[PDB]
Every structure is written in structure tokens, then in C-alpha cells.
Design a protein around this motif. Sequence first.
Motif, short mmCIF file in Angstrom:
data_model
loop_
_atom_site.label_atom_id
_atom_site.label_comp_id
_atom_site.label_asym_id
_atom_site.label_seq_id
_atom_site.Cartn_x
_atom_site.Cartn_y
_atom_site.Cartn_z
N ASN A 1 14.22 51.83 -30.52
CA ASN A 1 13.03 52.18 -29.74
C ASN A 1 11.78 51.36 -30.02
OD1 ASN A 1 11.84 53.68 -27.74
ND2 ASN A 1 11.04 55.21 -29.17
N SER A 2 11.63 50.92 -31.27
CA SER A 2 10.51 50.07 -31.69
C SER A 2 9.26 50.92 -31.93
CB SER A 2 10.23 48.98 -30.64
OG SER A 2 9.34 48.00 -31.14
N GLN A 3 9.47 52.21 -32.17
CA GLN A 3 8.37 53.14 -32.37
C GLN A 3 8.38 53.72 -33.78
OE1 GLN A 3 8.53 56.90 -30.21
NE2 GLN A 3 6.34 56.70 -29.75
N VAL B 1 1.13 57.24 -34.70
CA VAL B 1 2.08 56.44 -33.92
C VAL B 1 1.81 54.94 -34.04
CG1 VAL B 1 0.72 56.73 -31.79
CG2 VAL B 1 3.16 56.13 -31.67
N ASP C 1 3.54 51.26 -32.30
CA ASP C 1 4.47 50.42 -31.54
C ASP C 1 4.68 49.15 -32.36
OD1 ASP C 1 6.02 49.14 -29.64
OD2 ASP C 1 4.48 49.10 -28.09
N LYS D 1 6.41 46.25 -31.67
CA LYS D 1 6.58 44.95 -31.02
C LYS D 1 7.93 44.27 -31.35
CE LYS D 1 2.07 45.83 -30.82
NZ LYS D 1 1.35 44.88 -29.91
#
Length: 384
Positions: free
Chosen positions: A85-87, A103, A105, A107
Motif C-alpha cells: 500500500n505504501s502507507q 499517517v 505516504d 512514495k
Amino acid sequence: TKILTETEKYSVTKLSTDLSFLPFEGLVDTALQKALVNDLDHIYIWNYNSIQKDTPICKISLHSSPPICLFTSSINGICIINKKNSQFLYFEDISTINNLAHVLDLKLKDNENITSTINCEPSGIIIATSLGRVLFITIKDSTGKPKLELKQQLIKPQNSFFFRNLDSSKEIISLKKGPIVGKGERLLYITTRGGSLQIWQLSINSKSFKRLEINIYEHVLDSLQDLYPFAHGTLAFLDSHPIYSDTSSAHLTLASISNGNEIYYLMITVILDEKTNSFQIFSIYKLNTYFTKSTVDLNHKPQLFIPNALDSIVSPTLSVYVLFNNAVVMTQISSKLDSSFPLRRKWEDIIRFNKDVEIIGSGYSTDSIYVICKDMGVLKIASH
């Protein structure tokens, strides 16, 4: 609690807590005496020493595969890393849950997934990806206010390759934390499948930098080849672990080599000299109680544990544990590393698992290693 075996040399004990609450699965024991297991849907946290009664904290994720979770100290905390997911998710307090979060992100490329993650408590958390990238992610300020940030990329993503095959050489097979070295600053040991070993120095407030990089592959291969000609072209490193809790000089590595059919496993003791940017191979040990078949899916990369290397006080002999999915191999080597009259290996034994045993987790304190088994329970394993 049952002692399942109590040989002269080792023992295995099933801890009191049973795993009935659980109906793929996550993989953690910490020496906060907490065990953690994820489904795709929930996290289950419990004190694995509870003594015969359930009190799992049950935490919900949703409304891909299961995420990797990590405990973090209080200001307890939890990080929820999502592999594809890259989260990146962080909670300061378990207690403050609600169910009905910080949170980030990350990349990541459509290609890449998170393959390893460890916690360098003062500096931060370290992510390693399938493209060989290593990210340094922080949780706080210097005067640490809780706020996460992708502070630095220690290693770049392996070159968008030209081939269908990757370069195996740049695959991260070990992230280990080293000692503390001041305010917010700690050492990190990265090792790769191609036998490159990096010592990094992490920092919250400063920049993190590489203190040393060596490569042991050629010199190791040379040390094996007369014995094992087929080591040429097959030598591959699988894990690495520092031997001492307070210095970065010495490391034990785990490697494999393959003739046609079998895959054998070796361990090399390496000694780094930071001043001379050099290294020297102290010894090589073969795991004689274990091999694998080449055709067999090797993708459950084994894990190396040295309990004493979490300890401030060094033990005369080091109990070493290698965990495959089949088994735990145990051996003991001296902690001396002074190569005059060196006291050689005397012992090695294996604990094979029944085939219906699925190990969903592990961890280790300074005395023992632990393994979570889906329908069985947690096991404390230790050698004497």
C-alpha cells in the motif's frame, strides 16, 4: 506451563497462554513481555507470560496481505506498516484506541513492497523494501513532540533494472540496531544478500550517515571454495547479527551455498576495523544438522538470533539460534574472538517441527528465543 523437552543441553517450554482467540498471520514478540499477531482484519496483543487466562487487546484495521506492526515506547505506541500500500500508520497510545492516527505516504513504486522493518528507539524506525531501498522514518522532534516524518533515505532503490530478474546482490537481508551514541543517535547495521555490510549512524536532529561499508563476499567465497567448490556461484548471505550489544566491531553472518540438489548453511564470524575500513574473518561454522532441497521454495528466509547480544554483560559462550520454518538449529560458540588457543565449537542440535506447525511469530530476550505457533502456543526455547 508445560516443559515439552528439558535435555541436558537445551529445553523447550510452552507458555501458559493459549491461542484460542485466533480463528495468514503477523509475527511479533517484544521484551516488553508483549506478543502481537495480525490477521488482515485485527491485531491481537497480549502478555505472553499471563498465566492461563485471556486478556488480548483486539485492534481493528479496516471496514493485499497483512501489515507489519511494531511497538514504540510511550510519550504504549504502535506502528502499522502496509507492505504494498505504501502507507505508514502510527498511534501514540494503544489505550487511546476507540476503533469505531498519524499517517505517512511513503512514495513507493508500483513495483516495490516493504520486506523488513526494525525499531531504533531513540533515532527512529527503519524500513527496507524489495527494491533494496532503506528509509529512515522518525516519530518525534529533538525535544520530541509526537509527529512522524520520512527524515532520510539511507539507501536508494535498486536501479530500475534492465532485466526480468532483479539484482539479488542489493537485497536487504538484515537490519539490526546497534548501541546508543548520544541524544537521539543510534547505530544501525545493514547487511545485504551480496555480502555488503554497512554501519549507519542515525540521528533525529542531525543527518544520518554511513560510518563504514565493507564487502565480505569475495573473501568469504575464497575461504570456502577449496572445501566447497560449488560455493562459487551460489554463496548467498541470509542474515547477520552483531555479537556484542555495545560495540560494532564484530558480527555473525548466516549464508547458504548450493550444489545441484541440497542447500547447506554456514555462519561466518566477521570482525570490522572502522579505523582501517577493513575486516577479517574470525571463523566459519557449518550447520551440519540441517540442509534444504533446491526445488523447495526457499522463501521463508531464516532468522539468526544471538540473545546475549542484547545483554550488557557478555557470556563466555554464545548460544546461537537459527530459525527456519522447519526447525530451530542451536549451537554455541565462544564469545572470546582472540584467536590464540581459541576454544572451538563442541555442540549443535536441532529441534524439528511437525509439518502441521505454522510459526506465525518470533522474538528473543537475553536468555531465550520465542516462537508463536498457530494452534499450539508460544514456546520459550533456550540452550545451556
